[model samples]
Target: QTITVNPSTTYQTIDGFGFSEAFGFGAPIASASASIQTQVTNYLFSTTTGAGLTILRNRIAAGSGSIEPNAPSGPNAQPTYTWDGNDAGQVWWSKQARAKGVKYIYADAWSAPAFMKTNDNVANGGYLCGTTGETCSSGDWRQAYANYLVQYIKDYANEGITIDFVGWLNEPDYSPNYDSMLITSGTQAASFIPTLYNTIKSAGLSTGIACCDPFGWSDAVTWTAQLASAGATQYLARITSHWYASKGTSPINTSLRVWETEYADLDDAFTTTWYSSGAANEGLTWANLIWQGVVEADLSAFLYWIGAQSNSNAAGLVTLNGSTVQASGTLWAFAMFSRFIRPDAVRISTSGSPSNVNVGAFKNADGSIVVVAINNNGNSETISLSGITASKVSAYYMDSAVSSPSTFSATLNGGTVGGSLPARSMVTFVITT
Candidate 1:
């Protein structure tokens, strides 16, 4: 119940939290509902009005995007890519989010064009680097492919959307039969990264490169370490991975920051509402995921698999059907971190947690000290801290006992602060200036 924190000890500066905006699979519901989009966007990027999430992972269309069955599009359609056009749906989302002060706007390709791959197909696994004869490119496509990604950035920019980072591959090691995927390793990535970097540089673009968005923390670390050791990290600014495993992730190398970019209940069992959903799709699971990312992995950025989708609980944070918007516990769980923790706030050391409770402390630039605690227990417990030097504290919490968060005061006296957390809930304690 009792906790301790040392503000003098701090770690990685949190970049942000976010999710992907894919109009391809998510379009059917998002396309027809403007009100749905507005509601969902407000749940995320509205700094003063919402979770205050500051990052958005955009899908850079590879020219062959498949709309989901529930959406209003056909198969193998070019809904995602067009040389003469911009990604209007995604651009629209970006425009609104930026208006709310969202940054860390980055894009990643699910696959290269079919012609750029070895098998000349975007669906099956393929490469674009090179070989003796059966090259990734049609005899050569590295520079062209680099320009391909950069061109997507330019196209989006022409629409007033500025992309900050671009990924060369998404789950480059995984092979899904129909989706645009590439099967590759660190050596291949090492060989291809510098070429892509030079292309972006030559074009006078400041877009940084995100690498090898593989599935597990352990699986990705070795490959990324090799990629850096191979000198392929020359222009690479960030390392990213996905979550198939939820806990106990080793930190990436010290120099570069790591991101657990995507996770969602994309399984057979799903639900859209927080109070009614099972554990697999509820806020508690997401809270644990965020906990592991910020504490265990020491990651700088965290993102959900998808932000807004047409189907409620169909593996996205918010689901939409016409004007109705359905939000999950995961979205509010994201707010537990995104709303209170500012970008550049460093996660400091916090101690004294029972087996079921998790604690995280952070120090903000405004001289405020923040401690967020999650209690999985059935009874409310208190965390008394002696290290924080403050006289006033506020506590806000959401749990089964409350439909939405309700605020109360915490005791901060004698150079120590004491916080109360509700059972099976997440609470944020702020010692303000």
Candidate 2:
């Protein structure tokens, strides 16, 4: 298919684009028997040729329902596996990442220490149900928990790695029967986050706190309100939510503005929810395009669930087979954004028909612009750029047949710039002035 570009098309500026390391869950050193140093060196830091993702959402030490039954266990078992935040795995994955021009690194916890909870177990919807002062019998375990988190941040810093963001919890709204914590809106506001923030401040950690990584927009609304009522606004830096299910026709733009205005104290908001388990039965490419469009349209930061998975249809960018890494349709779907919309670009205005073709535009740091258009339909369509024309342009595409997207170059003149979008494929175009 061919696409034409016009020089007069107006362009919009972009802030940035990135992905989290939660996708590396299955690849954690403790979980796999493979050599940790080898995996980190070969897969994560081998070259810009690999996934080349910069942001690493390092998981803090905590047990999850997902861990194998016989895995070595302890409060900080997983974290202790090998990360001194130095040398090969730590040095390359985190430090060298920054050296390689990587941007941000964040950390999130699946649950608090097991001993801090009521059931003393990391599985089956168990929660830290005791009153703030009632749980640990030593004033309040909340304070101790806060101290623990603060120390964690400082410890990593001491090892020459800095954490830019810290999420308070992962999907607190869902009662997953595995490695989950039941944190109600009230409990989260009154107990969990406030103390954690206090400890961070007292310890002088620069890490920003992200609250209520809720499952969807509705949960974001509810939890934002709870934080406001509790006057816990000062502690939070960003409102983070996930896009677990289809939001129907409610319109994410309206929902986002409402949350922003009502919760005016919060800084930035992020939505990292992509990959609907239900979408798996339908073709992966279709599911990939649909969810990526929804997330890009709504959230400031677009993050997927897992980077790599063995295949429960949990939405992974890459699939791993021992030492082998094969890119998935979802991986290409993500590249549609990460490869084009850089970290310093701002999302600009987009006006076009929805669904038939999903469109997003960004202006990059080098005075160039990028437009990402996805054709979700089973038949190809000619894309029209009303105002923009290009003398030279670069295009990258991913269709159902290709495991990864490939790039091509083209030139454009005047009038409606057109290109043929294949069935269930995503296309990205970069235009330079």
Candidate 3:
């Protein structure tokens, strides 16, 4: 297959890829033995030894009476705040991620404290008391919720971890058994963005604000339409969605960066194999999915559901069992891009690959070019590249037969680099001039 990389033609700036360690997800890794903990951390955060994930999305605990204890006398009154300095072990994970050069630490809240919600229960669906249409016996909690989020950012900053982005809702459209709140529509979200935006600004923090994360792509589209109609886009930093009911086909109708923040084959049990009979949640499937997102949907960032969890399921990139860590194919699938493309790298135009072989190109800030290719078919294919001339070319690949990525030889010819892409494998080529 012949693939051409045009560095001159570019698209969205890559914000990097990562996962969450929220909702008791990081506890296992945090409690693991010293060497085991370090090993798992390296497999997820180490640039040379692991995926080099640059984004760390930490959950802002809303309920469990942990963050804000003893509900305020009223929505208008000040509330007491408390923190053990550890957000489900996320604080320690954030420090480790920062030490590995993670640039973004997003603090996302699943819901507001029960006192501020209409239902007064964080588990079931409820609405913020002060949004446009939502009303509660307790006074407007809009300002209170906003202040809560700001305080969280300030506290994290005090812990030496800057919360790069903050959002007050997750899966706003659907109510679950866990902590959740319903914003109903974009106009309602708009009603609160200004308040949250202003509160963050007044606190003298530069943290970016994201909003209205829904469960599906179409849901995000609907929310975005409402948000735009309400003129809330101006205050938002990114439009985020989870690819659960649907995936990204066309780009969302927003100029701000779009992020597929959470996804995994939760339906299937966890497996570490790279590929097996073209099954769901395979490594090749993830690689191809990411290619579609970055190439077809123009997403700036793509993240999985959880990084490392104690659960023996596909929701996490790696599973921890009694001090042992078993990584999934999806982990390396993420590594194929995150380890090389880097934050601030620009996605360049790359075309001319045959069917079943997907290609995406990017140029890093250091002037290195990265070309990722995923071969989906059964037979092995040799990829020939053109358009960029490089002095040195290196290639690494992960296929169905290997537990981890293996290096492959590449030849720098007259003006292009060529390499063998194994059957059902994802290969990343790093070209240095």
| Residue pairs with clashing backbones, model 3 | none
For model 2, residues 217-267, the per-residue Cα lDDT tens digits are: 576667777777777766676666665632312333222211110110012
lDDT for model 1 comes to 0.72
Candidates 2 and 3 compared by TM-score, better number: 3
Best-matching candidate per lDDT: 3
Ranking by lDDT: 3, 1, 2
**What are the runs in model 1 whose C-alpha is more than 4 Å off?**
23-35, 65-81, 84-88, 129-137, 245-248, 268-278
Against the reference, the lDDT scores of all candidates come to 0.72, 0.52, 0.87
Badly placed stretches (over 4 Å) of model 2 are 1-52, 63-92, 95-101, 126-139, 245-297, 309-315, 389-391, 408-411, 415-417
Q: How does residue 284 of candidate 3 score in lDDT?
A: 78
Return the TM-score for each candidate structure: 0.90, 0.73, 0.97
lDDT of 1 by residue, 116-223 (tens): 667667676777645223354236666557767877888877877889889978876677875455545676677678878888888888888988788667657778
RMSD of each: 4.9, 8.0, 1.2
Worst 10 residues of 2 by lDDT: 257-266
Kindly give the stretch of ten consecutive residues in candidate 1 with the minimal lDDT sum.
66-75
